[PDB]
Design a protein around this ligand. Structure first.
Ligand SMILES: N[C@H]1CC[C@@H](CNc2nccc(Nc3ncc(C4CC4)s3)n2)CC1
Length: 291
């Protein structure tokens, strides 16, 4: 039906014999991730395997492969190929040894310098998407991958949306409750700045270790978000002033006053970024903590 379009995007042939030595490195929602070995040419890959029946809205699987294949960028995980295997779609990507930003924010303490360096590379990914008319809608530490060179890349395009000058705003109540911007949570028309909000939230995770209200349930977080607006930090006096300033412009209630990704890339806060090799001690720490 609309699945006819899906079957025509995919490459054909045996992924189970183009690739081997499969271990689970991850299991998200409609995403089991494996690493594997390309028997031909030798390279190591990440393959995401998704059950077709779990996703009723197949137009999102299509939109996922398209956006990734059409918006390649050094701060986005690299799409290689895809395959339909029975009741399951396999997406193949370039593997990056490293871990999730989630492992770092939950197991280590980041300094301002490291936080600024992550924020800068995420803002580069978002300025690129936003200029190509794509909103991610699911920004969070869990969708940021850090390489063993200190590479920072954005992943997980399954929720993203395309806009145009004619349909410049979206209205679907989509995202992960704790990172969602109030305009989304309260069903108003919204734009690429919802990702800036989410990025503000992720900067909170890097400070405190968790998005605000994580101990609450998802529906409660949604109410809290609708009712507080701008979240508050447990301990604001621990942050520099320019960093408080940066948060403030990421977490503005007025969409008009909230920064754009282009704007925020000029913020003085990112001037303090460490070099990205600053991040590899974190990754090592995180790997040790999760052993
Ligand atoms: N949502 C996140 C994204 C997948 C990731 C799986 N865990 C992981 N662990 C160590 C290294 C590593 N590198 C990757 N490179 C490319 C990868 C492509 C998007 C699958 S994953 N991934 C963490 C869950």
């Amino acid at each position: 039906e609309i699945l006819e379009k899906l079957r025509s995007i995919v490459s054909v042939g045996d992924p189970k014999k183009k690739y081997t030595r499969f271990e689970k490195i991850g299991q998200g929602a409609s995403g089991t991730v494996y690493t594997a070995m390309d028997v031909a040419t030798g390279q190591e890959v990440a393959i995401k395997q998704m059950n077709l029946q779990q996703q009723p809205k197949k137009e999102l699987i299509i939109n996922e492969i398209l956006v990734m294949r059409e918006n390649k960028n050094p701060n986005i995980v690299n799409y290689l190929d895809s395959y339909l295997v029975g009741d399951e779609l396999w997406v193949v990507m370039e593997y990056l040894a490293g871990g999730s930003l989630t492992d770092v924010v939950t197991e280590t303490c980041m300094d301002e310098g490291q936080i600024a360096a992550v924020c800068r590379e995420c803002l580069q990914a978002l300025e690129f998407l936003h200029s190509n008319q794509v909103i991610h809608r699911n920004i969070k530490s869990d969708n940021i991958l850090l390489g063993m060179d200190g590479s920072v890349k954005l992943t997980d395009f399954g929720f993203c949306a395309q806009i145009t000058p004619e349909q410049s705003k979206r209205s679907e109540m989509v995202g992960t409750p704790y990172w969602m911007a109030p305009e989304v949570v309260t069903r108003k028309a919204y734009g690429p700045k919802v990702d800036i909000w989410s990025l503000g939230i992720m900067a909170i995770e890097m400070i405190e270790g968790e998005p605000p209200y994580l101990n609450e349930n998802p529906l409660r977080a949604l109410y809290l978000i609708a009712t507080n607006g701008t979240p508050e930090l447990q301990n604001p006096e621990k942050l520099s002033a320019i960093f408080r300033d940066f948060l403030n412009r990421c977490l503005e209630m007025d969409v008009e006053k909230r920064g754009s990704a282009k704007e925020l890339l000029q913020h003085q806060f990112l001037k303090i970024a460490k070099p990205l090799s600053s991040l590899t001690p974190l990754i090592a720490a995180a790997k040790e903590a999760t052993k």
